[PDB]
Amino acid sequence: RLESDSYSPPHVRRKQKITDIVNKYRNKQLEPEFYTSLFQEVGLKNCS
């Protein structure tokens, strides 16, 4: 594993995956638009 040049520790892989998830799935909202998200109920998105 140490000899190869295309290898990184698994936590680096997890960090890169997390960064990719953040980039591809973050929500573009302002500060006032985010507080009101907490109060709104969840779980009925596919039902209502």
């Binding site: 500060e31 006032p32 638009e33 507080y35 009101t36 109060f39």
Partner: protein, 49 residues
């Protein structure tokens, strides 16, 4: 879209905590006095100083 009342409340609170200026979207970001007008409510009734 018709934003809920709590949305406008938090917008106004954010404007208070940060500053009156630097927010000139003037469309829906801040609720204005003229928006309150309805059939039986005139927000500009005459008053005597």
């Amino acid at each position: 879209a018709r934003a809920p009342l709590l949305d406008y409340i938090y917008r106004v609170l954010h404007c208070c905590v940060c500053g009156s200026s630097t927010y000139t979207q003037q469309s829906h970001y801040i609720l204005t006095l003229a928006d309150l007008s309805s059939t039986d409510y005139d927000p500009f009734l005459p008053l005597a100083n």
